[PDB]
Design an enzyme around this catalytic site. Sequence first.
Site, PDB file in Angstrom:
ATOM      1  N   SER D   5     137.068  80.133  86.971  1.00 40.02           N
ATOM      2  CA  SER D   5     138.351  80.190  87.649  1.00 40.02           C
ATOM      3  C   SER D   5     138.319  79.103  88.721  1.00 40.02           C
ATOM      4  N   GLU D   7     140.140  77.661  92.454  1.00 39.53           N
ATOM      5  CA  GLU D   7     140.949  77.983  93.621  1.00 39.53           C
ATOM      6  C   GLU D   7     141.508  76.698  94.224  1.00 39.53           C
ATOM      7  N   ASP D  99     142.348  86.930 108.650  1.00 36.91           N
ATOM      8  CA  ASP D  99     141.676  87.081 109.945  1.00 36.91           C
ATOM      9  C   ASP D  99     142.602  87.755 110.962  1.00 36.91           C
ATOM     10  N   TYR D 123     131.110  89.538 100.553  1.00 36.71           N
ATOM     11  CA  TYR D 123     130.314  88.683 101.428  1.00 36.71           C
ATOM     12  C   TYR D 123     128.802  88.900 101.326  1.00 36.71           C
ATOM     13  N   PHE D 194     133.076  75.026 107.726  1.00 34.04           N
ATOM     14  CA  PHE D 194     133.449  76.237 106.998  1.00 34.04           C
ATOM     15  C   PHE D 194     132.332  77.269 107.153  1.00 34.04           C
ATOM     16  N   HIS D 244     133.711  81.103  90.151  1.00 31.20           N
ATOM     17  CA  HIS D 244     134.977  80.813  90.811  1.00 31.20           C
ATOM     18  C   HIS D 244     134.737  79.559  91.655  1.00 31.20           C
ATOM     19  N   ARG D 250     140.379  69.086  94.436  1.00 29.42           N
ATOM     20  CA  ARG D 250     139.787  67.934  93.750  1.00 29.42           C
ATOM     21  C   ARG D 250     139.148  68.452  92.464  1.00 29.42           C
TER      22      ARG D 250
HETATM   23  C1  LIG Z   1     137.451  84.755  97.766  1.00 29.36           C
HETATM   24  C2  LIG Z   1     138.022  84.666  99.184  1.00 29.36           C
HETATM   25  C3  LIG Z   1     139.343  84.184  99.339  1.00 29.36           C
HETATM   26  C4  LIG Z   1     140.001  84.151 100.618  1.00 29.36           C
HETATM   27  N1  LIG Z   1     141.255  83.587 100.645  1.00 29.36           N
HETATM   28  C5  LIG Z   1     141.928  83.617 101.875  1.00 29.36           C
HETATM   29  C6  LIG Z   1     143.265  83.100 101.920  1.00 29.36           C
HETATM   30  O1  LIG Z   1     143.901  82.558 101.006  1.00 29.36           O
HETATM   31  N2  LIG Z   1     143.907  83.258 103.158  1.00 29.36           N
HETATM   32  C7  LIG Z   1     143.413  83.841 104.314  1.00 29.36           C
HETATM   33  O2  LIG Z   1     144.055  83.950 105.352  1.00 29.36           O
HETATM   34  N3  LIG Z   1     142.162  84.300 104.217  1.00 29.36           N
HETATM   35  C8  LIG Z   1     141.454  84.191 103.061  1.00 29.36           C
HETATM   36  N4  LIG Z   1     140.069  84.673 103.015  1.00 29.36           N
HETATM   37  C9  LIG Z   1     139.417  84.981 104.302  1.00 29.36           C
HETATM   38  C10 LIG Z   1     139.586  86.459 104.664  1.00 29.36           C
HETATM   39  O3  LIG Z   1     141.007  86.772 104.804  1.00 29.36           O
HETATM   40  C11 LIG Z   1     138.736  86.807 105.935  1.00 29.36           C
HETATM   41  O4  LIG Z   1     137.339  86.927 105.558  1.00 29.36           O
HETATM   42  C12 LIG Z   1     139.230  88.097 106.648  1.00 29.36           C
HETATM   43  O5  LIG Z   1     138.742  88.097 108.001  1.00 29.36           O
HETATM   44  C13 LIG Z   1     138.864  89.385 105.958  1.00 29.36           C
HETATM   45  O6  LIG Z   1     139.459  89.609 104.666  1.00 29.36           O
HETATM   46  P1  LIG Z   1     138.981  90.692 103.666  1.00 29.36           P
HETATM   47  O7  LIG Z   1     139.967  90.765 102.570  1.00 29.36           O
HETATM   48  O8  LIG Z   1     137.568  90.495 103.316  1.00 29.36           O
HETATM   49  O9  LIG Z   1     139.149  91.977 104.593  1.00 29.36           O
HETATM   50  P2  LIG Z   1     138.361  93.362 104.590  1.00 29.36           P
HETATM   51  O10 LIG Z   1     137.733  93.602 103.263  1.00 29.36           O
HETATM   52  O11 LIG Z   1     139.315  94.333 105.156  1.00 29.36           O
HETATM   53  O12 LIG Z   1     137.161  93.064 105.629  1.00 29.36           O
HETATM   54  C14 LIG Z   1     137.268  92.619 106.994  1.00 29.36           C
HETATM   55  C15 LIG Z   1     136.322  93.320 107.999  1.00 29.36           C
HETATM   56  O13 LIG Z   1     136.770  94.628 108.324  1.00 29.36           O
HETATM   57  C16 LIG Z   1     135.687  95.530 108.116  1.00 29.36           C
HETATM   58  N5  LIG Z   1     136.256  96.827 107.783  1.00 29.36           N
HETATM   59  C17 LIG Z   1     136.870  97.261 106.631  1.00 29.36           C
HETATM   60  N6  LIG Z   1     137.399  98.438 106.727  1.00 29.36           N
HETATM   61  C18 LIG Z   1     137.119  98.820 108.050  1.00 29.36           C
HETATM   62  C19 LIG Z   1     137.436  99.971 108.795  1.00 29.36           C
HETATM   63  N7  LIG Z   1     138.177 100.962 108.294  1.00 29.36           N
HETATM   64  N8  LIG Z   1     137.027 100.006 110.078  1.00 29.36           N
HETATM   65  C20 LIG Z   1     136.358  98.994 110.613  1.00 29.36           C
HETATM   66  N9  LIG Z   1     136.005  97.867 110.008  1.00 29.36           N
HETATM   67  C21 LIG Z   1     136.425  97.846 108.705  1.00 29.36           C
HETATM   68  C22 LIG Z   1     134.816  94.889 107.029  1.00 29.36           C
HETATM   69  O14 LIG Z   1     133.488  95.352 106.896  1.00 29.36           O
HETATM   70  C23 LIG Z   1     134.897  93.466 107.461  1.00 29.36           C
HETATM   71  O15 LIG Z   1     134.009  93.096 108.532  1.00 29.36           O
HETATM   72  C24 LIG Z   1     139.282  84.649 101.770  1.00 29.36           C
HETATM   73  C25 LIG Z   1     137.923  85.124 101.595  1.00 29.36           C
HETATM   74  C26 LIG Z   1     137.281  85.140 100.366  1.00 29.36           C
HETATM   75  C27 LIG Z   1     135.791  85.537 100.390  1.00 29.36           C
HETATM   76  N1  LIG Z   2     136.439  81.977 101.659  1.00 27.70           N
HETATM   77  C1  LIG Z   2     137.515  81.431 101.095  1.00 27.70           C
HETATM   78  O1  LIG Z   2     137.619  81.214  99.888  1.00 27.70           O
HETATM   79  C2  LIG Z   2     138.654  81.080 102.060  1.00 27.70           C
HETATM   80  C3  LIG Z   2     138.498  81.284 103.438  1.00 27.70           C
HETATM   81  N2  LIG Z   2     139.559  80.970 104.317  1.00 27.70           N
HETATM   82  C4  LIG Z   2     139.380  81.172 105.775  1.00 27.70           C
HETATM   83  O2  LIG Z   2     140.451  81.947 106.412  1.00 27.70           O
HETATM   84  C5  LIG Z   2     140.664  81.420 107.780  1.00 27.70           C
HETATM   85  C6  LIG Z   2     142.088  80.838 107.828  1.00 27.70           C
HETATM   86  O3  LIG Z   2     142.282  79.841 106.816  1.00 27.70           O
HETATM   87  P1  LIG Z   2     143.006  78.451 107.189  1.00 27.70           P
HETATM   88  O4  LIG Z   2     143.803  78.647 108.423  1.00 27.70           O
HETATM   89  O5  LIG Z   2     143.702  77.963 105.972  1.00 27.70           O
HETATM   90  O6  LIG Z   2     141.744  77.493 107.516  1.00 27.70           O
HETATM   91  P2  LIG Z   2     141.754  75.926 107.127  1.00 27.70           P
HETATM   92  O7  LIG Z   2     143.103  75.393 107.451  1.00 27.70           O
HETATM   93  O8  LIG Z   2     140.577  75.288 107.756  1.00 27.70           O
HETATM   94  O9  LIG Z   2     141.545  75.943 105.521  1.00 27.70           O
HETATM   95  C7  LIG Z   2     142.468  75.262 104.658  1.00 27.70           C
HETATM   96  C8  LIG Z   2     142.057  75.460 103.195  1.00 27.70           C
HETATM   97  O10 LIG Z   2     140.711  74.963 102.892  1.00 27.70           O
HETATM   98  C9  LIG Z   2     140.044  75.914 101.970  1.00 27.70           C
HETATM   99  N3  LIG Z   2     138.986  76.649 102.728  1.00 27.70           N
HETATM  100  C10 LIG Z   2     138.906  76.780 104.063  1.00 27.70           C
HETATM  101  N4  LIG Z   2     137.828  77.510 104.368  1.00 27.70           N
HETATM  102  C11 LIG Z   2     137.223  77.840 103.234  1.00 27.70           C
HETATM  103  C12 LIG Z   2     136.082  78.577 102.930  1.00 27.70           C
HETATM  104  N5  LIG Z   2     135.357  79.120 103.906  1.00 27.70           N
HETATM  105  N6  LIG Z   2     135.719  78.741 101.633  1.00 27.70           N
HETATM  106  C13 LIG Z   2     136.444  78.203 100.641  1.00 27.70           C
HETATM  107  N7  LIG Z   2     137.546  77.490 100.911  1.00 27.70           N
HETATM  108  C14 LIG Z   2     137.952  77.296 102.192  1.00 27.70           C
HETATM  109  C15 LIG Z   2     141.148  76.898 101.573  1.00 27.70           C
HETATM  110  O11 LIG Z   2     141.850  76.394 100.435  1.00 27.70           O
HETATM  111  C16 LIG Z   2     142.053  76.913 102.767  1.00 27.70           C
HETATM  112  O12 LIG Z   2     143.370  77.300 102.370  1.00 27.70           O
HETATM  113  C17 LIG Z   2     139.619  80.319 107.963  1.00 27.70           C
HETATM  114  O13 LIG Z   2     138.444  80.838 108.599  1.00 27.70           O
HETATM  115  C18 LIG Z   2     139.291  79.878 106.569  1.00 27.70           C
HETATM  116  O14 LIG Z   2     137.958  79.357 106.499  1.00 27.70           O
HETATM  117  C19 LIG Z   2     140.782  80.451 103.809  1.00 27.70           C
HETATM  118  C20 LIG Z   2     140.926  80.250 102.431  1.00 27.70           C
HETATM  119  C21 LIG Z   2     139.866  80.563 101.565  1.00 27.70           C
END
Ligand SMILES: Cc1cc2nc3c(=O)[nH]c(=O)nc-3n(C[C@H](O)[C@H](O)[C@H](O)COP(=O)(O)OP(=O)(O)OC[C@H]3O[C@@H](n4cnc5c(N)ncnc54)[C@H](O)[C@@H]3O)c2cc1C
Ligand SMILES: NC(=O)C1=CN([C@@H]2O[C@H](COP(=O)(O)OP(=O)(O)OC[C@H]3O[C@@H](n4cnc5c(N)ncnc54)[C@H](O)[C@@H]3O)[C@@H](O)[C@H]2O)C=CC1
Lengths: 285, 285, 271, 265
Positions: D5, D7, D99, D123, D194, D244, D250
């Site tokens: 997949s 992203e 976040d 994670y 990152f 993934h 790119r």
């Molecule tokens: C594959 C992937 C894609 C992502 N794509 C994006 C994206 O497009 N846009 C974006 O904004 N962010 C994205 N993120 C970042 C993500 O949104 C952040 O890591 C965010 O802070 C937590 O999201 P989560 O879905 O893991 O939340 P959760 O699974 O809810 O986890 C967040 C925290 O809350 C804790 N927690 C859960 N339930 C409870 C509870 N009831 N009480 C207390 N603590 C609790 C967890 O242990 C953890 O520390 C991505 C991350 C990954 C790994």
């Molecule tokens: N773990 C993930 O796959 C992603 C994590 N995030 C995180 O959520 C928070 C908010 O995101 P933005 O404001 O867009 O930050 P940003 O503006 O720095 O990130 C822009 C883009 O770069 C890529 N990216 C950024 N951090 C990444 C990461 N740790 N792993 C894989 N791809 C990443 C994503 O496509 C994201 O939309 C940041 O901490 C960002 O790192 C955001 C998108 C994906």
Amino acid sequence: FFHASQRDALNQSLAEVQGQINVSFEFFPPRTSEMEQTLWNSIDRLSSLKPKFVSVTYGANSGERDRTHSIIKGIKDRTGLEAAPHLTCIDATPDELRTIARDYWNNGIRHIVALRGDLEMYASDLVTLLKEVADFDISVAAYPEVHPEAKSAQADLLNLKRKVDAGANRAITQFFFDVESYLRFRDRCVSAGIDVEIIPGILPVSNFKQAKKFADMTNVRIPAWMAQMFDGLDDDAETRKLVGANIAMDMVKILSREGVKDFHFYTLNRAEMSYAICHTLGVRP
Amino acid sequence: FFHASQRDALNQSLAEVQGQINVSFEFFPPRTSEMEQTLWNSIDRLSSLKPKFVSVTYGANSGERDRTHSIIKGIKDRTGLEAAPHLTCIDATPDELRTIARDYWNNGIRHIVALRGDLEMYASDLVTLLKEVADFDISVAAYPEVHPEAKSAQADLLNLKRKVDAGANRAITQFFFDVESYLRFRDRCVSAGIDVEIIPGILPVSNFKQAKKFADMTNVRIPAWMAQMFDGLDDDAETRKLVGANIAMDMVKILSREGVKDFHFYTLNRAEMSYAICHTLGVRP
Amino acid sequence: HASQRDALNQSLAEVQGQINVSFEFFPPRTSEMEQTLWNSIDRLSSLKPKFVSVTYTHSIIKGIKDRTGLEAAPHLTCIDATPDELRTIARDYWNNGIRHIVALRGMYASDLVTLLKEVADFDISVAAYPEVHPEAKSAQADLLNLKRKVDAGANRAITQFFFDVESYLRFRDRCVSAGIDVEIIPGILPVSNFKQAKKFADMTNVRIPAWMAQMFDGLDDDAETRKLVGANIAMDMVKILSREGVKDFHFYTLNRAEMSYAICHTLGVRP
Amino acid sequence: QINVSFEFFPPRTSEMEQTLWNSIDRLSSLKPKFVSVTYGANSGERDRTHSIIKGIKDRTGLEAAPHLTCIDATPDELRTIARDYWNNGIRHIVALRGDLMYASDLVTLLKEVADFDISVAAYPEVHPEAKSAQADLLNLKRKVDAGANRAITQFFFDVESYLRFRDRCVSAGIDVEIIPGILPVSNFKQAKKFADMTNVRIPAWMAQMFDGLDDDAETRKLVGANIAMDMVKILSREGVKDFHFYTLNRAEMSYAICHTLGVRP
Ligand SMILES: Cc1cc2nc3c(=O)[nH]c(=O)nc-3n(C[C@H](O)[C@H](O)[C@H](O)COP(=O)(O)OP(=O)(O)OC[C@H]3O[C@@H](n4cnc5c(N)ncnc54)[C@H](O)[C@@H]3O)c2cc1C
Ligand SMILES: NC(=O)C1=CN([C@@H]2O[C@H](COP(=O)(O)OP(=O)(O)OC[C@H]3O[C@@H](n4cnc5c(N)ncnc54)[C@H](O)[C@@H]3O)[C@@H](O)[C@H]2O)C=CC1
Ligand SMILES: Cc1cc2nc3c(=O)[nH]c(=O)nc-3n(C[C@H](O)[C@H](O)[C@H](O)COP(=O)(O)OP(=O)(O)OC[C@H]3O[C@@H](n4cnc5c(N)ncnc54)[C@H](O)[C@@H]3O)c2cc1C
Ligand SMILES: Cc1cc2nc3c(=O)[nH]c(=O)nc-3n(C[C@H](O)[C@H](O)[C@H](O)COP(=O)(O)OP(=O)(O)OC[C@H]3O[C@@H](n4cnc5c(N)ncnc54)[C@H](O)[C@@H]3O)c2cc1C
Ligand SMILES: Cc1cc2nc3c(=O)[nH]c(=O)nc-3n(C[C@H](O)[C@H](O)[C@H](O)COP(=O)(O)OP(=O)(O)OC[C@H]3O[C@@H](n4cnc5c(N)ncnc54)[C@H](O)[C@@H]3O)c2cc1C
Ligand SMILES: NC(=O)C1=CN([C@@H]2O[C@H](COP(=O)(O)OP(=O)(O)OC[C@H]3O[C@@H](n4cnc5c(N)ncnc54)[C@H](O)[C@@H]3O)[C@@H](O)[C@H]2O)C=CC1
Ligand SMILES: NC(=O)C1=CN([C@@H]2O[C@H](COP(=O)(O)OP(=O)(O)OC[C@H]3O[C@@H](n4cnc5c(N)ncnc54)[C@H](O)[C@@H]3O)[C@@H](O)[C@H]2O)C=CC1
Ligand SMILES: NC(=O)C1=CN([C@@H]2O[C@H](COP(=O)(O)OP(=O)(O)OC[C@H]3O[C@@H](n4cnc5c(N)ncnc54)[C@H](O)[C@@H]3O)[C@@H](O)[C@H]2O)C=CC1
């Protein structure tokens, strides 16, 4: 080949964890002028490692409660470190305990290691009692190899869950030498839904006779290779220390690789071994 | 899981090898009253381990040949153990060497560590010269990481084969900290048709600054994790000793599992570390 | 598997600053290639190689020595030359600062080594074949010839490129037990053009492992992916070789610096 | 045998927009099981994420999953959005919290709306805000129990970290696939930023590998592809059959890595 590369990888991994490990040290109230001096020397040296906290034991049914409280005060006054007194409920009434707890809180003691103590109240009852008094940080005892009085491993595990649900924010294990037992127990804690870290209690061994006595009283398994390692060293304190440090260093290296980032050391008031083990974990002054 | 079980297995294996390991100790001629006392204390303690033999170094171009011979005599007279003097050929003529060799043989010295020494004769020439004098037991130097003056690893390896073919009945390696380098070298020795055991020379490290100096002069690699392990311990001799013993114990445990049953210890005249390492190998009094 | 990979990568990171490298180039046939070649020289020179060589030329050598000051070792064949002229060219080089010469046949190499020796004390470098030279009657025979060339004065041996690491290792083991006291410097061919490489291979009796053929299958029209896959293959090869003790590498750059430069970077060879 | 997949993120400039579609065309030929598009609260919003998803679907026919978070969004808003997505053919969503409702609350909300295919974040080195490793693992189990069909991990460079995590997941009874998120590195500075924000460990050998290449993009790409190809090789040997890729829009690196895995046009 395999064994060699595995070592190098384990060693390099440990090197890269420097700065991410939290440590705590356990001490006991000195009984003599000599031990008193030793203890403060150890406190001074281990304090430079910036432990998350240190704790001071209290022998249940000893009636020497004042000694524990006295040492705790001295530690806070000298190091500014968080010092946690161990508090037992088997030898005190709820009223006495609430009084003792209120005094601790007013004296700036906000972290307590809540225990039952050896033989109306179990540790879980003390946890609840403490939480009603104030918002204390509470640590409780966990037993990877099961407390000797438990009806079953399941009951002991459920008991730990009870203590956490009542307010315990962390669990500290009895010492162990079978690393797999700790790892298996950690997984079982997850299965039981326990969400707090299970902090391994580490016992660096310099005196095997003493450790074996502690172990035999606590159902802790001493592997055959470990017993053989100390055999013939009754009168060789130097070799015992080197062998024991090797065992402890090996133990925390494997634990660190498995994700453990918190360690509690049973110093027995000596700093040398724990100080060196911490050094290998990247915990340095 | 994996890391844990691997440890237990390695540890148990080591425990079961007790009684099958041969050890030898290397000492150097004391330069002061203090070192003289230390040396004899060490000799007495390590002699109780019943080493296959012990050796005494001789600094090439030092002109202090008499010191080496004197110590060798004292060791034989006090312990009854086989003591092997190191003999260099870079600072003596064939005639002088034959005389020196004949004297050793007549004095009951039947084992010699034949070396060239640092800058007309290479070690292989000394081996041949010695064999013509008498049927000596001859040990020669091997370099897992290649002698710094070799034209190539192949040439250095061929040189070792030359020394063995000339009469050397055993090879002792320069110290090393990269265990894989020794293992790979052992396999290459087989490929080259060398039929003598390649005995690992073990350097227990308590003084890192000193070891690094030795290493840098000899092309021996000090892994990054090892350098990090000793970092910050310049003024902590206690921690250095514990960390160094852990490294050495880990090293011989892995070597033992790979089939190594002979170890030569660079004691630097101190017994504590080597004595404890031997203890872990089942070599006890 | 994972830990071993971590151990291999770390050991490689620590070898940084102890590996010697050399680069082989060929005289350009066009203005474009002239430009490319010298750009590579300037690029690869910053890596301070033990020496660089030019296939057979003398002018390129001079230009390199006059521009970078690196030890430019021109190749020398026995074809289309008489022992008389050989000594002439040989002495012509030595009298021009050219001390290193890669003696090749193209009257065998051994005779060429002996001749250069009987002229001056050059640093002689000859060719070695881990997978046996096509003309050689037997592996042992070609092996003995190498020894003959070394015995004649050959300082070091440079292997024909190879892709099966075990073949090189087995050969090195047979070289020592055969009495050859010189290092068998592996010749590394970073592949960006599989078609061209497979061509060289079929012309030199070099084997292309099945996994390698499969790895390049379908990339005829994908130069970008070919380069990443080839860099990866070359990367993994030198990493394994380094762990086996190899501290010397010879790169067949084909006048291109990109790949060789990157591979050297991973060997700690940096500007 | 192996599923992949990709992203992508919503382009914010004309140049990045061109780059993205070039990459989509290149990568779509590898027939990924699905592709996803990230969400940036203050860097594009839901509409840009949605626009790209719709474009990918219309242009390639591939299953495209938007990343949907619940920050500053009401449950009623989230239900309306999910309903619209489902009605428009978007049947796979990557449910996240974003976040500072937790992600598990979003999973539940979505399943109530429709039978969405749902992916959640995992994670290996623990989410930064988690009370503990145990709590983070229990939360992943909560998300899976709520309806998540698979977990996608934050990127990692310590392969054993991923392997040990997968084992803990299995021990915890988490039965869905724990898909490693792979970040091919061509820009180390960006990768370190990152990583430094997410507690991800960068091995010493890797930092060393990129040292001195700040102004040498060509070498960085070759070095990074090597690292990534090496990683997927080991993961594949350990039973991983799903990857993934964090393409950062790119295609060259991810395309080449897939090639080595036998995933080709
Ligand atoms: C594959 C992937 C894609 C992502 N794509 C994006 C994206 O497009 N846009 C974006 O904004 N962010 C994205 N993120 C970042 C993500 O949104 C952040 O890591 C965010 O802070 C937590 O999201 P989560 O879905 O893991 O939340 P959760 O699974 O809810 O986890 C967040 C925290 O809350 C804790 N927690 C859960 N339930 C409870 C509870 N009831 N009480 C207390 N603590 C609790 C967890 O242990 C953890 O520390 C991505 C991350 C990954 C790994
Ligand atoms: N773990 C993930 O796959 C992603 C994590 N995030 C995180 O959520 C928070 C908010 O995101 P933005 O404001 O867009 O930050 P940003 O503006 O720095 O990130 C822009 C883009 O770069 C890529 N990216 C950024 N951090 C990444 C990461 N740790 N792993 C894989 N791809 C990443 C994503 O496509 C994201 O939309 C940041 O901490 C960002 O790192 C955001 C998108 C994906
Ligand atoms: C980190 C650590 C520090 C310690 N420090 C001290 C100290 O300073 N002073 C001291 O005196 N001791 C100390 N101890 C020892 C400890 O007090 C003994 O192990 C004691 O027997 C049990 O205390 P606990 O807090 O584990 O009790 P609990 O958690 O109450 O457990 C004790 C037993 O009761 C069982 N149990 C719990 N609830 C019930 C129930 N309702 N019905 C039946 N069985 C039940 C449990 O399964 C277990 O077998 C320490 C132990 C640890 C691991
Ligand atoms: C177990 C051990 C104990 C030692 N004890 C001492 C000691 O007490 N006193 C002391 O002074 N030193 C001692 N040394 C150090 C040693 O003397 C130096 O390392 C010395 O430089 C080489 O001695 P060697 O016996 O290995 O020489 P050799 O085996 O002759 O090797 C030295 C070099 O000469 C090369 N060589 C051999 N034959 C030829 C040839 N024909 N042409 C060209 N090159 C050739 C070899 O490849 C190598 O690079 C010891 C070393 C070891 C490993
Ligand atoms: C690093 C490298 C650089 C090269 N550079 C060039 C270059 O610049 N220019 C160029 O024109 N070519 C070049 N070549 C190719 C080379 O010239 C050919 O491989 C050629 O076939 C001769 O090989 P050789 O130098 O090994 O000759 P030799 O070492 O003489 O060996 C060639 C063959 O003769 C056989 N043999 C040797 N002695 C005898 C004997 N007495 N009787 C019978 N058989 C014998 C050997 O077993 C072998 O099969 C290079 C090859 C390498 C590996
Ligand atoms: N597991 C632990 O951390 C502790 C367990 N205990 C248990 O409670 C009993 C009564 O305590 P005391 O009156 O102090 O008896 P004691 O006077 O025999 O013990 C003195 C000190 O030695 C240390 N110690 C003793 N047993 C230990 C053990 N099993 N693990 C780690 N450290 C240990 C403690 O600091 C203790 O305060 C002990 O005999 C022991 O069974 C007591 C303190 C700590
Ligand atoms: N590898 C070995 O076992 C030895 C190597 N040597 C080499 O020969 C040189 C001259 O010897 P000395 O006059 O004694 O110099 P020195 O006076 O500096 O060394 C004194 C003693 O320290 C020990 N030692 C020194 N370097 C060592 C090493 N690399 N490995 C193990 N032990 C070592 C030896 O017992 C030596 O006799 C040394 O500097 C060293 O380079 C000397 C003795 C032993
Ligand atoms: N193995 C080697 O290092 C070399 C092999 N040769 C071969 O000898 C014959 C005559 O040489 P040219 O007229 O230069 O042929 P060519 O004109 O096809 O080759 C031109 C240049 O490309 C490089 N090259 C070509 N084939 C190579 C190979 N198999 N391995 C490594 N590098 C190679 C060399 O720098 C050579 O000078 C040809 O078959 C050629 O392939 C020529 C030079 C070097």
